[PDB]
Design a protein around this ligand. Structure first.
Ligand SMILES: N=C(N)c1ccc2cc(C(=O)Nc3ccccc3)cc(Nc3ncccn3)c2c1
Ligand SMILES: N=C(N)c1ccc2cc(C(=O)Nc3ccccc3)cc(Nc3ncccn3)c2c1
Ligand SMILES: N=C(N)c1ccc2cc(C(=O)Nc3ccccc3)cc(Nc3ncccn3)c2c1
Lengths: 234, 234, 234
């Protein structure tokens, strides 16, 4: 996250850090708890991941320093990537992780509500342990930044070489300065409406990070609520 | 219906009583007229029904005592159950009855409008001839009860062993006392908005009837308007 | 267009005139620029069209007199008709034309935004070079008429022999007098909302033109945004 600040412990209890253990353990992406056995994240996080055996999901984390070899984690039983996904910039950048065990909800870890088709937001935040600038490194403390949504027409003007579809949502300041970046991929764009937090977007792509006239692009979660229901069925 | 009152004759002209003639004739479920040849109802009503030949639809009824062997009815040519339906509690609880003859609309019998995707309600009523308590019997006079809708987040808290999906809608009072019950299955949850009645829900399931902190669960009809259009085509 | 007035040059820069060259060149239908290589129009325009080789799309036109044998046009590489389309009156009346070359946007020719599912209008206009009455001829100057939308319930009362679905939108005055007509087929029903023009409808059918109690029927474009995205993908 560029231009953000440190989060308060437990203020984004749906946020997870997804690690890979290959070659050595490191944070790979963000994600969101949406159900007792389910994390919603970005499909592009799984480039080159041939097996879910190398993944670990950590919930209830503020600082990456909390994660040691003796820290509990959730194993991943299955990676479900949208069957129309090819690459972040062409959309469908959404994936589910089915966990091996169920999350026990607590003040530190609980699910975020999915947006309602009926709500198709002025208090939106992007969170993560990603870079603070394009060439940087993973941050210890979960960062947060408040960013305004921009219309799809506005976003399209900023990305003339792309097709900004109704299955994408954009957020950014005209002058830049606050945005998601590498490593924030897969995490939430969370919006508070009528005192309830909604998972409105999934961090997906953008040209650089926090540049002027280059909003962040996110998967528009409401366009996938039918897909999420279909894929999370027994 | 628990905690309801007798309806005025003709005030719910889309409501039908669906009877089975097997082994002897009795009310089986409610339904709603949505087209000249079409009744919308719940799929769970058809457990063990192997043929539409045993069904009779009666329109324009207030009291079951109006139904005698000499009373006119509509035969059922076809039962169309949603192909994803398995059981009420897992959703897709929706079915169409294609009638053998067409309904001639009148002050006693006319169709209810389907909800618009654009309207994704404070004046909602559930109606039927079902039980007044869990272990009871079919009622003579069509009953009505005004019940507030509850959010899907609220409903989910009341049914922790279920998945309350966006394809379901819930309605009930926190203290209970008014609800649908056995025998109301398949009937409408009708909401009046901008002076027009909309078929918002279909009576589907609930734990007990009218219990405290146990809202009634209904099929969210707006999530099926595309299915209804597809299935009612020639 | 019945009861309209001449347009100002460039005030509907998404409007195109689609011509056929067979047997001799003439205006066939209207359409709307929605992308650099894409025109959205009505499927019924292509009755008897066996090849896209006979089509020519002209952009930036006010008067048909501007079109001469030396006027530039866009060739059509492919006609994509909705696979559920059979006839205008039963819906799915939508088609895409993939152009052979891309449109270079200018003050005279630019795309209209598609409606958002979130916007599911009081300033709606229908435009075209069609007839001014049922038995007439193509008009030289692009005509415009402001027409109010009517609800689908109201529209259904006016077309009792048809099924007015949620995939259709109607517009008209109770007393008639302003409407689209033959030759306006395929053109836009454009609505201005929050200072942005949205392509809300595609001119499709109606009984006569501008008759009392016979609104114009249009394809409800918002119900096709997923189809448009699917079909315009590489
Ligand atoms: N500005 C953003 N909102 C954003 C969000 C996520 C990103 C993820 C990657 C990303 O997935 N990075 C990546 C992953 C694997 C391998 C290589 C790069 C790359 C980004 N942008 C970028 N721009 C220019 C050059 C490099 N990166 C993002 C911007
Ligand atoms: N409270 C409700 N809104 C509701 C609505 C419909 C129902 C239909 C059946 C239903 O379909 N009953 C049934 C049908 C066939 C065979 C056996 C039972 C059963 C219900 N609840 C219930 N709860 C506990 C024990 C028994 N029933 C309902 C509640
Ligand atoms: N009133 C309208 N909004 C409307 C719009 C488009 C139409 C297109 C055709 C149309 O597609 N005409 C056509 C095309 C090819 C062959 C024959 C007729 C026919 C119409 N109406 C009509 N009504 C009665 C008798 C004839 N036409 C329309 C009304």
């Amino acid at each position: 996250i560029v231009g953000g600040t440190a989060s308060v412990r437990g203020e984004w209890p749906w946020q997870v850090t997804l690690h890979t253990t290959s070659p050595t353990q490191r944070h790979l992406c963000g994600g969101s708890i949406i159900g007792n056995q389910w994390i919603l994240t970005a499909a592009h996080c799984f480039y080159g991941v041939e097996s879910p055996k190398i993944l670990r999901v950590y919930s209830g984390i503020l600082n990456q320093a909390e994660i040691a070899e003796d820290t509990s984690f959730f194993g991943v039983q299955e990676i479900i990537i949208h069957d129309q996904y090819k690459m972040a910039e062409s959309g469908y950048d959404i994936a589910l992780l089915k966990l091996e065990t169920t999350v026990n909800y607590a003040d530190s870890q609980r699910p975020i509500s999915l947006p309602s088709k009926g709500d198709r937001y002025t208090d939106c935040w992007v969170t993560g342990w990603g870079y603070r600038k394009l060439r940087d490194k993973i941050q210890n403390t979960l960062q947060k930044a408040k960013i305004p949504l921009v219309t799809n027409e506005e976003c399209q003007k900023r990305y003339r070489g792309h097709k900004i579809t109704h299955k994408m949502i954009c957020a950014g300041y005209r002058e830049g300065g606050k945005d998601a970046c590498k490593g924030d991929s897969g995490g939430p764009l969370s919006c508070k409406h009528n005192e309830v937090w909604h998972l409105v977007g999934i961090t997906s792509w953008g040209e650089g990070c926090a540049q002027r006239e280059r909003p962040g692009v996110y998967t528009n979660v409401v366009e996938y609520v039918d897909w999420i229901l279909e894929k999370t069925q027994a």
